[PDB]
Nucleic acid binder design. Structure first.
Ligand SMILES: [Mg+2]
Ligand SMILES: [Mg+2]
Ligand SMILES: [Mg+2]
Ligand SMILES: [Mg+2]
Ligand SMILES: [Mg+2]
Ligand SMILES: [Mg+2]
Ligand SMILES: [Mg+2]
Ligand SMILES: [Mg+2]
Ligand SMILES: [Mg+2]
Ligand SMILES: [Mg+2]
Ligand SMILES: [Mg+2]
Ligand SMILES: [Mg+2]
Ligand SMILES: [Mg+2]
Ligand SMILES: [Mg+2]
Ligand SMILES: [Mg+2]
Ligand SMILES: [Mg+2]
Ligand SMILES: [Mg+2]
Ligand SMILES: [Mg+2]
Ligand SMILES: [Mg+2]
Ligand SMILES: [Mg+2]
Ligand SMILES: [Mg+2]
Ligand SMILES: [Mg+2]
Ligand SMILES: [Mg+2]
Ligand SMILES: [Mg+2]
Ligand SMILES: [Mg+2]
Ligand SMILES: [Mg+2]
Ligand SMILES: [Mg+2]
Ligand SMILES: [Mg+2]
Ligand SMILES: [Mg+2]
Ligand SMILES: [Mg+2]
Ligand SMILES: [Mg+2]
Ligand SMILES: [Mg+2]
Ligand SMILES: [Mg+2]
Ligand SMILES: [Mg+2]
Ligand SMILES: [Mg+2]
Ligand SMILES: [Mg+2]
Ligand SMILES: [Mg+2]
Ligand SMILES: [Mg+2]
Ligand SMILES: [Mg+2]
Ligand SMILES: [Mg+2]
Ligand SMILES: [Mg+2]
Ligand SMILES: [Mg+2]
Ligand SMILES: [Mg+2]
Ligand SMILES: [Mg+2]
Ligand SMILES: [Mg+2]
Ligand SMILES: [Mg+2]
Ligand SMILES: [Mg+2]
Ligand SMILES: [Mg+2]
Ligand SMILES: [Mg+2]
Ligand SMILES: [Mg+2]
Ligand SMILES: [Mg+2]
Ligand SMILES: [Mg+2]
Ligand SMILES: [Mg+2]
Ligand SMILES: [Mg+2]
Ligand SMILES: [Mg+2]
Ligand SMILES: [Mg+2]
Ligand SMILES: [Mg+2]
Ligand SMILES: [Mg+2]
Ligand SMILES: [Mg+2]
Ligand SMILES: [Mg+2]
Ligand SMILES: [Mg+2]
Ligand SMILES: [Mg+2]
Ligand SMILES: [Mg+2]
Ligand SMILES: [Mg+2]
Ligand SMILES: [Mg+2]
Ligand SMILES: [Mg+2]
Ligand SMILES: [Mg+2]
Ligand SMILES: [Mg+2]
Ligand SMILES: [Mg+2]
Ligand SMILES: [Mg+2]
Ligand SMILES: [Mg+2]
Ligand SMILES: [Mg+2]
Ligand SMILES: [Mg+2]
Ligand SMILES: [Mg+2]
Ligand SMILES: [Mg+2]
Ligand SMILES: [Mg+2]
Ligand SMILES: [Mg+2]
Ligand SMILES: [Mg+2]
Ligand SMILES: [Mg+2]
Ligand SMILES: [Mg+2]
Ligand SMILES: [Mg+2]
Ligand SMILES: [Mg+2]
Ligand SMILES: [Mg+2]
Ligand SMILES: [Mg+2]
Ligand SMILES: [Mg+2]
Ligand SMILES: [Mg+2]
Ligand SMILES: [Mg+2]
Ligand SMILES: [Mg+2]
Ligand SMILES: [Mg+2]
Ligand SMILES: [Mg+2]
Ligand SMILES: [Mg+2]
Ligand SMILES: [Mg+2]
Ligand SMILES: [Mg+2]
Ligand SMILES: [Mg+2]
Ligand SMILES: [Mg+2]
Ligand SMILES: [Mg+2]
Ligand SMILES: [Mg+2]
Ligand SMILES: [Mg+2]
Ligand SMILES: [Mg+2]
Ligand SMILES: [Mg+2]
Ligand SMILES: [Mg+2]
Ligand SMILES: [Mg+2]
Ligand SMILES: [Mg+2]
Ligand SMILES: [Mg+2]
Lengths: 159, 122, 240, 46, 95
RNA sequence: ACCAAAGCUAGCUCAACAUACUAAACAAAUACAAAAAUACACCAAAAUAAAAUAAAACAUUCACCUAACAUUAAAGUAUAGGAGAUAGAAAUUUUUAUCCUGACGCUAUAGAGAUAGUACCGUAAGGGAAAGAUGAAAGAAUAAAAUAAAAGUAAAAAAAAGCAAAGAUUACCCCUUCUACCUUUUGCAUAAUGGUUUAACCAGAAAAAAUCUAACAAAGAGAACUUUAGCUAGAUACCCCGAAACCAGACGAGCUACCCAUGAGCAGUUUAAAAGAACCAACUCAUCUAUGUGGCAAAAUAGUGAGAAGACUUGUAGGUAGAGGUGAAAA
RNA sequence: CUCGCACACGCUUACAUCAGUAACUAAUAAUAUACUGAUAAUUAACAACCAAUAAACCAAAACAACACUAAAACGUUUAUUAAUUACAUUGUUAACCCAACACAGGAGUGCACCAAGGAAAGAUUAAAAGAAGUAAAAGGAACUCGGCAAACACAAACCCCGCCUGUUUACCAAAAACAUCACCUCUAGCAUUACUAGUAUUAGAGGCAAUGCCUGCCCAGUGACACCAGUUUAACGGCCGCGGUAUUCUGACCGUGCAAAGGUAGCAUAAUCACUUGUUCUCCAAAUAAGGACUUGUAUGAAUGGCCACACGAGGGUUUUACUGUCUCUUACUUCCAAUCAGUGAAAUUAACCUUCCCGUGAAGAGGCGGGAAUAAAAAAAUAAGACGAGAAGACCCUAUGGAGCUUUAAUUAACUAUUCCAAAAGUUAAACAACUAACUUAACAUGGACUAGCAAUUUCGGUUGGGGUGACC
């Protein structure tokens, strides 16, 4: 979003102008997730995929800032999880293909605690952490019973 | 300029506006358009027989007050579960798995008056 | 705000269904079309524009229907006919001489010998003689009639070439279609609708037409008598 | 002809145009309520 | 002229002055003649010379240019090789 | 002698600190038409700020203008600009804790709008007030105590003649002499402007060069600079109210324009007729005149008129929104 | 004397009973539906709230027999399931609402025209002027812009313009303006939100104004189609001269110039630049009026329509009758105002006033200056010549490097909407041709850069001038 001078003479009218990317419908194949997604991409995306030599490469090999998509970060979170888990459900019938594929991507393998937090919005993160911390408050009967057993076992051991 | 401040009440609008004053619904609309009451929604007052019992609305003036101790979950634990738990631990019959004999309830959904979602008005 | 169109009713009914006029306003509420509103109140009769419609998918063959009544319709210029066969009735657009207590044939069948054409008969174009008068013309086969439904209008079949029919629309433009498309044989009802004389401004209001504007506009370049060579022929035949 | 009687009261119209629900159904309406809250109005809406 | 700038709150200089004049340190300002590059074929040799001169501004103009210019442009400069260093001081002026 | 007058408090303002930053209060009820316990769904969203203004016009441009990085300098320098108005860096430099928090700030036309976002005014967004004064005690009102001073009146109407006074005079007048005041203008008693009167409020602000006074002086400044008597410090300076507009975003179709739904009216007479026929009520209009003209009325009253089964009148609910809408065009 | 009772909508206790009213509300009292306090009150049978899904039904309301055209609101039954069980909840006052007021205004429906509702006058007096009415001798439009208003009249004719009913500037214009039946041009070959659940006898964009007789000539310019040729005037718009001729004024004829065509039919001193009160006839005792003719109108004229005509018109003009206080020429009497008494009690306005007349003077029209005249002081009632009287920082006029609206052949040009093209994107073909890589393709979206238009956006109207403008100048 910006402005331009008409004719490029600085002395002409100054005019608001917006330059929009040319978008395409293309279906891409992910090896690790074993799937064909129909995605809107640019010619630039295709050139970066070409340059990084694979779709899955391009997704793993690029930082959060450079993809810019929440969907890119979710693709990445997914296949990062599939790599850290070594998920058998990738190719159930052929462990040959499975090891073969998990092989080339071994550079990006990261631990599990890390891999599920990669593509997350602050919202999604806060939610997730709230769910892990979800506990029904412990009945005071329990706590009072444990204090009482402490006291009774120290009354029994003192004599 | 109409009226902004005065509250919005069934007296104020057209015929089509009926807003209760906050009494609770006793039923539903039936087939004939006539209204049907559900005997279960109508609160049944539970009133004890007062005749043979001695207590009065007021208290004698020379009668003493007392030191004020708000009941706490702890005191209630000690007047009830503590003697029983102590009796059965001293006898070694104590079972950390089932506390139900002492009056603890694992879940509320079985019993008639439940405490936490609070099934009863009063 | 947002208004919902009255045009939602899923099941077909011969019974008149109630409709809401909207004078010229789109669903946003602004005026789109000027000069429309507040005529007489009208119910709408659903018209089946697919003339060949086998009642059950069990028996596909060409079938025959009886004309029960021919009624005035408020919604369109042509007069319409109530037509019953098997267990079902439907409204169809009546041909000029169609009268009550009549018989009308609906057929998809072609054949080498063509057909002697009656009025209410519906046939595939391929099955008709080459000089015939037709109305309620399909575009693609199975689509339903669009062209030539107005009162007293008739097109004419011009020729048949390469498993395809070429017909002449009432605007005197030529139209090329597969010969498997259905058409009804004859001129549409109520031929004198042209010569009707609206007597007074009031009648125009009854028809739901609001008066023209009062603003004076100087005529522009667009006006004059333009004599344009008749446009090239429309073809809905999709070449491989 | 004679003017000043422009206001012809209806409760339905009143509450449909200016009411609480109407103010909360759009972002702009919510900003109205917010402004009035800010100024500390006794009556936020009709 | 901006007497109090926005960011700094100081007093700006008008650059259009700095491009066409030269301030000696005495307070004299020096300028080129007007139209000295213009239409030379049409002019006398004498007139051409009168144009090629560097000339001094009268008092009024000098005060004006001073006001349009900040303090920095009035400092004593020592340039290496400077043509005008000869002219910065005033001598034998009895006033 | 009335009307009146006088208080010193309520609170405020500006900073400092500070933890850290949506107060208080929640029993029920609250997003049906908020404050209405209880039935099968939907739910949600983003697009550069613009212009007034400066350039003595206006067309590129026009600091600040709801985006953390301060401070001493570099520096109003490099640069950028209808090379005009104006705009304007950086490299590089400097910055010593914590306590000593208060006031050459206001005192009821001030200070917050605030006793209050209340009354009241708007359909709404929104606008938005005024107001207090006894004493230790009024559980001291045949009540006791200190101003009686604004205009306005009363106590007390006036007595030839004249900008209302002044010279005077034994004496109020009588005599004599003077064409209100501001502003604005070549020039105003002007019959040119403004003001009933009283009280309280109500309008000149900046330190480049200069002058004046003083320090120290070939140097001066508590760092950064300036210097061929200079440098450093102080003191001397540049108003108030007012357009029609322009731009952004909200709020408005309960009036009215046109629609959509849904209701309701039209008696008598004349006619084969409910025919945008006829006569004439209810009803709807608003022709001509007279009243009225701060009115009964911010468009009415009295008479008189035009239509009156229609392109008719009319109730209720809904729609279209300002770069727009609507329009049987009257902008 | 007659706007009554109820409901809806709205209002929100203003209602009811008892008591009080020094003062507060009532534009004044008495007292109280409206001020104050205390205490009470509208009770459901009326009204609100008050099932879904399938399926059969083409057949108007109009006293509905049967029909008309503009084709029309309003439900039965059958099947499948629908908690089954006294009493639920809510509206119930009023003299009321919208108009700043206890406002002669605005307010839907059902029944009534009285059985229900109400009071034009606080008390006097009986001046003017003003308002509203009734009556009027003789005359009967002589009034006047006009028979405006009024009338014991409530009739006839003729023009202009619009065909007609209708619409419009709420609050200075109701019309000759607009619309309109009719007639004409343009633009469209089509599907689930408009047009339209339509399909060229249809639908949009317009012009003009029914009917009748008509609608002449022009495609050079400007548009618009045809992306160029060429076509279009019921598209924007146009439709001429000079000289010589019949004995004489004229000019059938002749010459010649220029044009895209050279104003045809009709009508005509007109609602038609001026000349104009053209000329003549009719009407009147008398007419710049009205009507009829003549008519170059060198500035009429044919769908930005031309000419006749029926009916219609609160349109604009003219005649006749009749009628009359319009008038000659006014008069009498009632009511409201009025004046006096009692109660309550506003507004614009206001430098200060101890506020005369004449002639002179003077910022060029003096209560106030000069020269003269006049002159006890005060109310109340009347008149409007002056106070350049009051009202509103003149709407006329000019100025301002002040605005805004509108129109374009002004200068700069976006977005958007359509067109056309190149690139992007998806593809497809030959293994191309001659002898000893290119070319072509494109469904809907859709990007970047151009093109042509539509719809628009931003901004401006140089100064001097014996006021501006025109002219002239700089
Ligand atoms: Mg209000
Ligand atoms: Mg109600
Ligand atoms: Mg009610
Ligand atoms: Mg019941
Ligand atoms: Mg229709
Ligand atoms: Mg029809
Ligand atoms: Mg039309
Ligand atoms: Mg028109
Ligand atoms: Mg109002
Ligand atoms: Mg400017
Ligand atoms: Mg200025
Ligand atoms: Mg300007
Ligand atoms: Mg800006
Ligand atoms: Mg440049
Ligand atoms: Mg300039
Ligand atoms: Mg205050
Ligand atoms: Mg205040
Ligand atoms: Mg006094
Ligand atoms: Mg004297
Ligand atoms: Mg003058
Ligand atoms: Mg002067
Ligand atoms: Mg003088
Ligand atoms: Mg004068
Ligand atoms: Mg005077
Ligand atoms: Mg004067
Ligand atoms: Mg004056
Ligand atoms: Mg004066
Ligand atoms: Mg002045
Ligand atoms: Mg003046
Ligand atoms: Mg003044
Ligand atoms: Mg004055
Ligand atoms: Mg200085
Ligand atoms: Mg000074
Ligand atoms: Mg501007
Ligand atoms: Mg401007
Ligand atoms: Mg409405
Ligand atoms: Mg009738
Ligand atoms: Mg009629
Ligand atoms: Mg009237
Ligand atoms: Mg009368
Ligand atoms: Mg009448
Ligand atoms: Mg009538
Ligand atoms: Mg009539
Ligand atoms: Mg509405
Ligand atoms: Mg504008
Ligand atoms: Mg508009
Ligand atoms: Mg209208
Ligand atoms: Mg007009
Ligand atoms: Mg106009
Ligand atoms: Mg009220
Ligand atoms: Mg009472
Ligand atoms: Mg009273
Ligand atoms: Mg009642
Ligand atoms: Mg009286
Ligand atoms: Mg009298
Ligand atoms: Mg009289
Ligand atoms: Mg009489
Ligand atoms: Mg007489
Ligand atoms: Mg006369
Ligand atoms: Mg006369
Ligand atoms: Mg009359
Ligand atoms: Mg008469
Ligand atoms: Mg008569
Ligand atoms: Mg007419
Ligand atoms: Mg008017
Ligand atoms: Mg009207
Ligand atoms: Mg009229
Ligand atoms: Mg009028
Ligand atoms: Mg017309
Ligand atoms: Mg014709
Ligand atoms: Mg005609
Ligand atoms: Mg013609
Ligand atoms: Mg042409
Ligand atoms: Mg041509
Ligand atoms: Mg003639
Ligand atoms: Mg003339
Ligand atoms: Mg002409
Ligand atoms: Mg024309
Ligand atoms: Mg003409
Ligand atoms: Mg007729
Ligand atoms: Mg007439
Ligand atoms: Mg009429
Ligand atoms: Mg008329
Ligand atoms: Mg008499
Ligand atoms: Mg009196
Ligand atoms: Mg006197
Ligand atoms: Mg004089
Ligand atoms: Mg004298
Ligand atoms: Mg004198
Ligand atoms: Mg007078
Ligand atoms: Mg006068
Ligand atoms: Mg005056
Ligand atoms: Mg003025
Ligand atoms: Mg004027
Ligand atoms: Mg003017
Ligand atoms: Mg100027
Ligand atoms: Mg200007
Ligand atoms: Mg141009
Ligand atoms: Mg601009
Ligand atoms: Mg000019
Ligand atoms: Mg000038
Ligand atoms: Mg002049
Ligand atoms: Mg002059
Ligand atoms: Mg000129």
């Amino acid at each position: 979003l910006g402005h331009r001078y008409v004719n490029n003479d600085k002395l002409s009218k100054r005019v608001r102008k917006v330059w929009k990317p040319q978008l395409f419908q293309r279906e891409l194949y992910s090896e690790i997730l074993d799937k064909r997604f129909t995605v809107t991409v640019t010619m630039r995306t295709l050139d970066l995929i070409d340059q990084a030599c694979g779709f899955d490469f391009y997704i793993l090999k690029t930082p959060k800032e450079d993809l810019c998509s929440k969907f890119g970060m979710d693709l990445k979170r997914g296949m990062l999880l599939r790599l850290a888990r070594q998920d058998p459900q990738l190719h159930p019938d052929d462990p040959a293909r499975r090891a073969a594929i998990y092989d080339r991507y071994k550079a990006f393998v990261i631990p599990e605690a890390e891999a599920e937090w990669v593509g997350l919005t602050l919202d999604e993160a806060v939610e997730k952490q709230r769910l892990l911390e979800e506990k029904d408050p412990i009945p005071l009967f329990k706590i009072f019973v444990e204090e009482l057993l402490g006291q009774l076992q120290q009354q029994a051991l003192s004599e | 300029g109409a009226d902004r401040m005065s509250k919005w009440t069934s007296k104020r609008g057209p015929r089509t506006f009926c807003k209760g004053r906050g009494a609770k619904g006793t039923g539903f609309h039936g087939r004939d358009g006539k209204f049907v009451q559900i005997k279960e929604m109508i609160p049944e007052l539970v009133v004890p027989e007062l005749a043979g019992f001695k207590l009065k609305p007021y208290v004698n003036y020379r009668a003493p007050e007392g030191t004020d101790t708000p009941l706490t979950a702890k005191q209630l634990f000690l007047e009830t579960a503590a003697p029983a738990i102590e009796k059965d631990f001293k006898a070694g019959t104590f079972d950390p798995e089932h506390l139900e004999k002492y009056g603890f309830e694992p879940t509320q959904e079985g019993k008639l008056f439940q405490l936490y979602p609070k099934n009863f008005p009063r | 705000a947002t208004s919902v169109s009255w045009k939602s009713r899923t099941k077909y009914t011969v019974m008149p269904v109630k409709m809401r006029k909207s004078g010229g306003r789109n669903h946003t509420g602004q005026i789109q079309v000027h000069g429309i509103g507040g005529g007489h109140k009208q119910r709408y009769r659903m018209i089946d524009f697919l003339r060949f419609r086998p009642e059950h998918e069990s028996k596909p063959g060409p079938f025959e229907e009886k004309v029960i009544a021919v009624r005035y319709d408020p919604c369109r210029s042509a007069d319409i006919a109530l037509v019953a066969g098997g267990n079902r009735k439907r409204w169809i657009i009546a041909t000029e001489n169609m009268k009550a207590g009549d018989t009308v044939l609906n057929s998809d069948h072609i054949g080498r010998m063509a057909v002697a054409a009656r009025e209410g008969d519906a046939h595939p174009l391929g099955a008709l003689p080459v000089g015939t008068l037709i109305n309620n013309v399909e575009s693609e086969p199975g689509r339903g009639a669009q062209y030539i439904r107005a009162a007293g209008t008739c097109g004419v079949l011009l020729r048949k070439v390469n498993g395809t029919a070429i017909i002449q629309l009432p605007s005197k433009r030529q139209m090329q279609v597969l010969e498997t498309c259905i058409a009804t044989v004859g001129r549409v009802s109520n031929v004198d609708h042209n010569k009707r004389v609206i007597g007074k401004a009031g009648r125009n209001r009854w028809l739901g037409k609001r008066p023209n504007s009062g603003l004076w506009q100087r005529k522009g370049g667009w006006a004059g008598r333009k004599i344009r060579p008749l446009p090239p022929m429309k073809s809905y035949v999709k070449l491989p | 002809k004679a003017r000043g009687n422009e206001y012809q009261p209806s409760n339905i119209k009143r509450k449909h145009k200016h009411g609480w629900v109407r103010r909360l159904r759009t972002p702009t309406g919510v900003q109205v309520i917010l402004r009035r809250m800010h100024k500390g109005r006794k009556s936020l809406s009709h | 002229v901006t007497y109090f700038s926005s960011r700094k709150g100081k007093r700006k200089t008008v650059k259009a002055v700095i491009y066409r004049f030269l301030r000696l340190h005495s307070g004299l300002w020096l300028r080129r003649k007007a139209g000295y590059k213009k239409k030379l074929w049409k002019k006398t040799a004498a007139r051409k010379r009168r144009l090629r001169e560097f000339v001094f501004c009268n008092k009024t103009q000098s005060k004006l240019l001073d006001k349009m210019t900040t303090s920095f442009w009035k400092r004593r400069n020592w340039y290496a090789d400077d043509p005008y260093q000869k002219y910065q001081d005033r001598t034998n002026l009895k006033v």
